[PDB]
Amino acid sequence: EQIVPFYGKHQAGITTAHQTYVYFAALDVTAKDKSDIITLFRNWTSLTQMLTSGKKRNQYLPPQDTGESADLSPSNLTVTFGFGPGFFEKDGKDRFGLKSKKPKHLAALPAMPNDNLDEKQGGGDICIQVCADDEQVAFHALRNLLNQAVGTCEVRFVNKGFLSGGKNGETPRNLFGFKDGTGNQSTKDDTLMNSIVWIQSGEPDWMTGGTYMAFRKIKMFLEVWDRSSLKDQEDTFGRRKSSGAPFGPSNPHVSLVKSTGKQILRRAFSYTEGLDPKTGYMDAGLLFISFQKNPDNQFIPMLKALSAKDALNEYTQTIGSALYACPGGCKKGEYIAQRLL
Amino acid sequence: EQIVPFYGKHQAGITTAHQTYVYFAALDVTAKDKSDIITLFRNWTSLTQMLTSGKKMSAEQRNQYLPPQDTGESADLSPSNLTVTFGFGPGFFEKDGKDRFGLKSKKPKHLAALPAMPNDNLDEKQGGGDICIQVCADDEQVAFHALRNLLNQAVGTCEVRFVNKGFLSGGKNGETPRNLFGFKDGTGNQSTKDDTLMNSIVWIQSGEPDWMTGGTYMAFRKIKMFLEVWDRSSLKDQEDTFGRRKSSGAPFGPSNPHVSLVKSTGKQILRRAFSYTEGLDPKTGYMDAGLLFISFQKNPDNQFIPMLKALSAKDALNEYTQTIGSALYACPGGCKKGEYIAQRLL
Ligand code: HEM
Ligand code: HEM
């Protein structure tokens, strides 16, 4: 059966096996009272449990389910929730009395020299990561979740992505043709995931069992890359394209990252969205998503090192950025982020 | 294996089993000499045959100072029933009053821009095109890899006009797929396994220039679907829009329900559409989604245009939809082994 458990010590969709498709939405809270947010997450919890477990009538009422996934398998559907800095303090105002529960490292990522950030393509009070092996299943889940948020939230953006693994289980390849994900530690090793991803202490209690999610929308210049020689492509990463093996002003991508001595859990997706109206070429890139218990220690040093000397900067540009705090898992009978009181 | 034959009496991707994902691109020809077009389709034929089959680009002793012949992101993927369908729009034969490449005598009978409809809101940049490429596969990464490498060969001869992409998931037990309104979509289609019906609805046998023999016409309509308005409507209003029950699809007895209004024309087409999403619409703040309506018919004047006239006038579905792009293409007959696509370019 293609069912991933929703309840647990941790949220699914983080160490869960990498599905093929993602829908990534961010929302801004427009409700005034925290009680409205409680109702939203209570209904989101009930709906998510129904959608992920495989669960499938008044004619005068609108359909509670939009119905386009009625005959489809759950397809390993997972839904992951997180909170941005604006959820705790907006324009200097503590809107829901949550200042005492703000995570240690929850803040907007520092500016980088080569950034070209669109403010409308990043940030957000709440993030929803919807993953499934079937895009129609993934969109159906996000669509029905967002319909519940009417009156309390405004949808900020909706991104979608794909990533296909090898037919025999090989490491998936990004849009540059290189194997992507080899540097990750095994998600099946609880000891390694507890040291890299999961939070055990030092944070507010609702973060116990949670993690931080970093989001970077990275445009990839496909037309420039495809015109480059194989040598230039392999020199950009410092790895052979087919095998991924190491061979041997700017530094190769992979060795530059390792020089920081830090580790994160990358769980990214490729994306394509028609022709870019300003360039006339395919609009494509990477929905970079990573999980780490401490972004200040693990993730920001990578941004600093790459933003300075990465040869990959010639073929990429970050246009959106966000950092979210993901709560711990939901116990059966509880709702997501129940430390909203 | 998930391999669909590229060569044949007909092009694949028309009566072929409906794959899950599509990339739909249109291109405008900027080259002046017909010889440049011949080279383009000769290379497209070679590349498509490789992509659709299990063949992979082996450049073992390649030159590292040359660009890779293949972009490489499908190296470890199965063909995933990849099909590539080519077609020609009216602009391929006449642009700004000029008879292009001396092909006026081979222009198909019914190849012309679709007539304007009252409820149309057509963006000229979201329709038309001299050449269409429909790339379908059960794996989106396989489909995009095919389109990307096909478009890379067109540099110098064509400019890409638009690239659309879509999805459509069939039931786990083979049930008819459901569109984004939750209704089963495709029941009205005749069986693609019935050669007699496909010959009467889709395939051209005579009456057209020889290169159209074994081909068909492809109609394209980009139809935005108002999900937020639809989702706030009652189930009865949703079912009254189509005249069919939502779960079962069963029929039940100025606005006319969609299906009975279509049936009143007495015509048949082969619908092969895909749903689409592109994030939030910057103009509405809601999800930008709809249907990439793709249909195949041997005579669009007889089979398809009467449907457009009937629907644009009385369709209750017009309350929840709006067409924003339109195009008509003439698809050549199949390519025989040893030939190249539409080789009636001489
Ligand atoms: C378009 C953007 C990017 C592309 C195409 C890309 C591609 C790659 C590739 C091919 C590898 C080697 C294989 C692997 O381990 O995955 C790699 C390694 C890695 N990259 Fe990137 N990357 C991108 C952006 C980033 C960013 C923005 C970060 C961090 C802020 C990052 C962090 C890492 C890490 C941690 C590794 C593993 C290094 C190790 O072996 O320990 N990547 N990347
Ligand atoms: C967003 C746009 C549309 C949606 C959601 C839609 C949906 C449907 C549905 C649910 C059915 C009944 C089940 C089926 O037979 O597939 C149907 C029937 C049909 N529709 Fe549409 N439709 C759309 C646009 C169009 C357009 C623009 C045309 C033609 C110009 C068209 C032609 C047909 C045909 C030929 C049938 C089959 C009629 C029969 O039973 O013989 N559809 N459509």
Numbering used by the authors:
A (entry chain B): 56 to 111, 117 to 308, 322 to 414
B (entry chain A): 56 to 308, 322 to 414
Give the article text:
Bacillus subtilis BsDyP belongs to class I of the dye-decolorizing peroxidase (DyP) family of enzymes and is an interesting biocatalyst due to its high redox potential, broad substrate spectrum and thermostability. DyPs are a family of microbial heme peroxidases that display structural features analogous to chlorite dismutases with an α + β ferredoxin-like fold. In BsDyP, the heme cofactor is partially buried in a predominantly hydrophobic pocket lined by the conserved proximal ligand H326 and catalytic distal residues D240 and R339.
The highest activity for DMP was consistently measured for variant 5G5, which gathered mutations S325P and A330V from variants 1F9 and 3G5, respectively, from the first generation, and mutation K317E from variant 54D6 of the second generation. The variants from the first and second round of evolution, 1F9, 3G5 and 54D6, showed similar kcatapp values for DMP, circa 2-fold of those of the wild type. Noteworthy, the kcatapp of the hit 5G5 variant is ~7-fold higher for DMP, indicating a synergistic action of the three mutations S325P, A330V and K317E in the functional transition. S325P is adjacent to the heme proximal histidine ligand, H326, and mutation A330V lines the cavity at ~3.5 Å to the heme. In the wild-type structure, the side chain of K317 is at the surface, located at ~10 Å from the heme propionate, but in 5G5, E317 is part of a region (309–321) that is not visible in the electron density maps. The tunnel that gives access to the heme has a similar length (~10 Å) and diameter (~3 Å) in both the wild type and the 5G5 variant, but the open cavity not only has a higher volume and area, but also an entrance width that is 6 Å larger in 5G5 (~18.0 Å) than in the wild type (~12.0 Å). The results indicate that the variation in the loops’ flexibility and the widening of the active site entrance in the evolved variant 5G5 negatively affect substrate binding, as reflected in higher Michaelis constants, Km, but simultaneously facilitate electron transfer from substrates to the heme, as assessed by the increased catalytic rates of 5G5 for DMP (and also for ABTS).
